[PDB]
Design a protein around this ligand. Structure first.
Ligand code: C8E
Ligand code: C8E
Ligand code: C8E
Ligand code: C8E
Ligand code: C8E
Ligand code: C8E
Length: 376
């Protein structure tokens, strides 16, 4: 957040989401690349959730003299996931998942000076996916997926100190000399910071598709190109379209040893004019039959000026640092747990009449349970 999320699995969390289009140790990855369906030879289920605990802080002084300070403006969150994939044939398979690829939340007191650009911003999203895949031969697979997205938005803004700003401007102008001018300033200054200035509530569905190609040099090495379509969501509440952006991703996975694999990816996102990319690299330690270990790093760059930035929507250049571990109870069942630390960069924000600074980070903790059907 983002507002884009990667938290589709706890195993992925532990590898900082690196080459997620090319690994297939559990069912979570089919949501990332429907072509991976052909790596599964038996019905496979997975479920869990990621707990996100952000710490995002705003600082600054308004030209009115009011503090623009705001501690801890991003609340914690639970992001659940469920996945299922199952072969139909030696060539065909299918899968289904419930995920969220998008969400954000910021809240300021309704008494905050910068209220007109920072009150309450709440977007929750749920992706429903059905996928199919076709294996052409030993090397090549293709996957196609259909997405139903449910989105719940809540916005409120407030006057903040706007009326104090207007009072300032009026008093400064020649009109500050007149009696009508003073009165008009006083009327503006007298507007409560907590005056509700805006309010939106909406819940809507949108639809999209996604596709993927898998190339396997052999059972230890593979590469993938994936594409997620944009999804548009028209809230008839009150325009008013919310645009979930395209994503392209290239992934690679190298099992360079019975005990070691690496996995990396480049992912690209453009929207609207303003794009972003993410690179990620990680390694997996297949210690033994019971224990697997997991570590990764990532970096995301969306170079957005500063007068295009929002305090209500934090989007900085960020780093991920992750470790994880999978314990398998047997050849059928396992549990993943992931941890990640997410670090933003202190950034300047010039929005409306205000100048802020913003710095954020987050701790992530995830657990998934995996189960494959038809012993063993
Ligand atoms: C688990 C997520 O899968 C739900 C399947 O979504 C149902 C869509 O219905 C088929 C197309 O209409
Ligand atoms: C200092 O921070 C306070 C920011 O709010 C500015 C307005 O002060 C209250 C006015 O409305 C009541
Ligand atoms: C590349 C072709 C696949 C693209 C189609 C996308 C939607 C496919 O979803 C179909 C899922 O339906 C599940 C069928 O249930 C299995 C029935 O047969 C199982 C026998 O083993
Ligand atoms: C009977 C005359 C009494 C004068 C009261 C007029 C209204 C006083 O409120 C003024 C509020 O303006 C705040 C000043 O803002 C800081 C100055 O710099 C801001 C430039 O706009
Ligand atoms: C548009 C192609 C971009 C390729 C990037 C990833 C390729 C990784 O595989 C390279 C090694 O594979 C050996 C080549 O295999 C023989 C020809 O088939 C390769 C087509 O991908
Ligand atoms: C918006 O349309 C932009 C079209 O260009 C898309 C090309 O993306 C190439 C980046 O992909 C490299 C790794 O994903």
């Amino acid at each position: 957040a983002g507002f884009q999320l990667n938290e589709f699995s706890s195993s992925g969390l532990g590898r900082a989401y690196s080459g997620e289009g090319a690994i297939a140790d559990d069912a979570g990855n089919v949501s990332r690349n429907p072509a991976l369906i052909t790596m599964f030879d038996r019905p496979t289920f997975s479920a869990g959730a990621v707990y996100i605990d952000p710490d995002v802080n705003i600082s600054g002084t308004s030209p009115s003299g009011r503090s623009l300070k705001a501690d801890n403006i991003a609340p914690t969150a639970w992001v659940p996931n469920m996945h299922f994939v199952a072969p139909i044939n030696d060539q065909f398979g299918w899968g289904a998942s419930i995920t969220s690829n998008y969400g954000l939340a910021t809240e300021f007191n309704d008494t905050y000076a910068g209220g007109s650009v920072g009150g309450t911003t709440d977007l929750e999203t749920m992706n429903l996916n059905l996928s199919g895949a076709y294996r052409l031969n030993n090397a090549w697979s293709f996957g196609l997926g259909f997405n139903a997205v449910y989105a719940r938005a809540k916005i409120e803004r407030f006057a903040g100190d706007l009326g104090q700003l207007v009072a300032g401007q009026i008093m400064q102008s020649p009109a500050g000399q007149t009696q009508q001018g003073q009165a008009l300033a006083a009327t503006a200054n007298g507007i409560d910071s907590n005056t509700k200035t805006a309010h939106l509530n909406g819940n809507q569905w949108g639809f999209g598709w996604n596709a993927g190609i898998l190339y396997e040099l052999d059972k230890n090495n593979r590469y993938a190109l994936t594409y997620r379509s944009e999804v548009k969501i028209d809230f008839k509440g009150n325009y008013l379209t919310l645009n979930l952006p395209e994503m392209w991703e290239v992934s690679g996975y190298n099992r360079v040893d019975p005990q070691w694999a690496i996995h990396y990816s480049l992912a690209y996102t453009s929207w609207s004019f303003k794009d972003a990319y993410r690179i990620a690299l990680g390694t997996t330690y297949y210690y033994d039959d019971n224990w697997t270990f997991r570590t990764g790093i990532a970096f995301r760059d969306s170079p957005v000026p500063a007068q295009n930035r929002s305090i209500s929507i934090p989007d900085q250049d960020r780093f991920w640092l992750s470790a994880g571990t999978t314990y398998a109870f047997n050849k059928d069942a396992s549990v993943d747990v992931g941890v990640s630390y997410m670090h933003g960069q202190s950034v300047k924000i010039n929005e409306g009449p205000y100048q802020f600074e913003s710095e954020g980070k987050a701790w992530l903790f995830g657990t998934n349970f995996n189960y494959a059907f038809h012993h063993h």
